[PDB]
Amino acid sequence: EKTVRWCAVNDHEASKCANFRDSMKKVLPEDGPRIICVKKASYLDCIKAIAAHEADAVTLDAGLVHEAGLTPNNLKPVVAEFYGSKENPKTFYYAVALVKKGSNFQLNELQGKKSCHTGLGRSAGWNIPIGLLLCDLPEPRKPLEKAVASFFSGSCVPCADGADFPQLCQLCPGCGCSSVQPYFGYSGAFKCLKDGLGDVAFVKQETIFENLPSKDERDQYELLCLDNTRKPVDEYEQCHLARVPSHAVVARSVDGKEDLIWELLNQAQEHFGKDKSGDFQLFSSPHGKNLLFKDSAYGFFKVPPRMDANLYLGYEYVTAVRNLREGICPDPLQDECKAVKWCALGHHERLKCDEWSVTSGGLIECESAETPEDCIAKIMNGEADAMSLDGGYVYIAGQCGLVPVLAENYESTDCKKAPEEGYLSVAVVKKSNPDINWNNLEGKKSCHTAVDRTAGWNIPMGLLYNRINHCRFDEFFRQGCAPGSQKNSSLCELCVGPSVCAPNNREGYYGYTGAFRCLVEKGDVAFVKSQTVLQNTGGRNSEPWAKDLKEEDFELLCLDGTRKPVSEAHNCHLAKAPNHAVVSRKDKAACVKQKLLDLQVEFGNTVADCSSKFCMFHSKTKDLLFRDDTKCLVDLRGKNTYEKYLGADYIKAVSNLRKCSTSRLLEACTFHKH
Ligand SMILES: [Cl-]
Ligand SMILES: [Fe+3]
Ligand SMILES: [Fe+3]
């Protein structure tokens, strides 16, 4: 029926797997997924067996999760171990350098020493330590193994090639890749030190605790710290090499059976987890330590579906592993600010970007994606560097670790001005329609810039939420067009653009303008910025649908139930909305700034004609890359943080709506517990 083929790495893992199977069989229903144990010689073979459908699941160290996610294997993390305790869970652990008390040497005296590692490519045992020594390893750092093999005078590096790099197997002939050889893994590394083969062991902070129950034995060991002092093994908080992410169970990217896997594992932990006691324990075993799952784990968390490997790992870890395999050293270097790569939605923004590229002489580079969230993801993982975003998306970007760099200012051409307090957010209706008002929306037809945008969603939806106290907005309005919503909800029923309901330009009713047109053609209410009516009436917008429209044909909804002319936003708006802002990663914020400020000098408001020369803030269509009413990109004057830039009030408002999010990227960015 439903089977999970679990991949066990060699014999001891095979025996634990069998006990696991049989035990589960007792507690699950005759359908409940059943385990099948497939035995392979190494984690690598397991990765391959899963790609090829021979198996479905294997728990791996984060460094190997990175390996498993590459082509052509393409696997992804779907369940994660957590540590610490049930009530205060952590999805990271510490890499430490473990030594014997009294051997005296510090972190900077490893050259020549003998080393014990958990395995090639693993976080604590290889990635972190080797990554700190890299730059000062023997100049020909390729291949890495040969260099590491000359720096230490003998090692145990499970999984490495002993044929070509025999020194890496001096302390463990064969470099066997499984718990069948005694010096493998967290346990083996520890043993390699304890038996005196090696002088140092690269493990995690629990290792010594899980192998030596009494403080008095543990008193024989110390940790090496980054400042070249030693500290007792209890003080790992102040004397670790790095924090690294959790070990995770990986599965195929498509047809991986993640649901089964999660079902099994969730039940497994309900029955055989750390609290329970029994003949079978999931985090323990008489056949060894860290079999199938780490003994130090306290349970699992379902990994958010949007999260792939890079995202699961995060940017610093991934870059660290990247560098290492890429022999890139950041020795006393200078100037990564060659060109800024911009992320563009859909076709049009791409075209505009290309144009901006050519003309800059490649100072601006273009990457593209089909959604705002995908663009933010690209930037998170350095596939791109920068994009401009509405406040609502700036929130998501911030929860995902990006920072605001420069704000779009709409009120003045003096680019040295501080960022404005924000634009006005209004609700607009047709004068034709006599009955609609603020207190009347239930039932009507609505138009929104996009889900998650400030004027189109966050402001109006949150203010309505505080009224209806539930989240089925698609049941409050009868019908709508709120791009980025579920293809088959009511809220997509008014959309039109080729790509129906997409959160981009391929949806006609997308954006400030799109939502206005939506109002003109099918809706009863549009949620947009205050300047929208003016920008699209009076022949200022020459499209057929708007050329003859008149400002006088529309009104605004005031919170108090009344209606007013559009010229009255100031006294008849929903709220203020922080200006759109440019985002990047901390690493590249400065670069990004400077190149934007400079490019603005030749391509900003100043350009007298935009059909002759290139204009950043001018768009062939509407609002490509920047808002067309953008005047200046102004420095943030200390509001270099998304909480700081958006401001309390806005944060407080978006938070109140947290429970209705449907953002896959936001759940992803909020999974890790640090
Ligand atoms: Cl291990
Ligand atoms: Fe690990
Ligand atoms: Fe906006």
Curated annotation (Swiss-Prot):
Molecular functions per Gene Ontology: ferric iron binding
Binding residues annotated for hydrogencarbonate 2, in chain numbering: T449, R453, A455, G456
GO terms, biological process: antibacterial humoral response; intracellular iron ion homeostasis; iron ion transport
Positions contributing to Fe(3+) 1 binding: D61, Y93, Y186, H247
CDD domains: PBP2_transferrin_C (cd13617), PBP2_transferrin_N (cd13618)
UniProt cross-references to InterPro entries, sorted A to Z: Serotransferrin_mammal, Transferrin, Transferrin-like_dom, Transferrin_Fe_BS
SS bond list: C7-C46, C17-C37, C116-C192, C135-C329, C156-C172, C159-C175, C169-C177, C225-C239, C337-C591, C343-C375, C353-C366, C400-C669, C415-C632, C447-C518, C471-C660, C481-C495, C492-C501, C558-C572, C610-C615
Keyword match Ion transport: yes
Gene3D superfamilies per the UniProt record, alphabetical: Periplasmic binding protein-like II
Positions annotated to bind hydrogencarbonate 1: T118, R122, A124, G125
Record-linked SMART domains: TR_FER
Localisation: Secreted
Record-listed Phosphoserine modification sites: S368, S661
Protein task: Transferrins are iron binding transport proteins which can bind two Fe(3+) ions in association with the binding of an anion, usually bicarbonate. It is responsible for the transport of iron from sites of absorption and heme degradation to those of storage and utilization. Serum transferrin may also have a further role in stimulating cell proliferation.
Name of this protein: Serotransferrin
Native organism: Oryctolagus cuniculus
Source taxonomy: Eukaryota, Metazoa, Chordata, Craniata, Vertebrata
Gene: TF
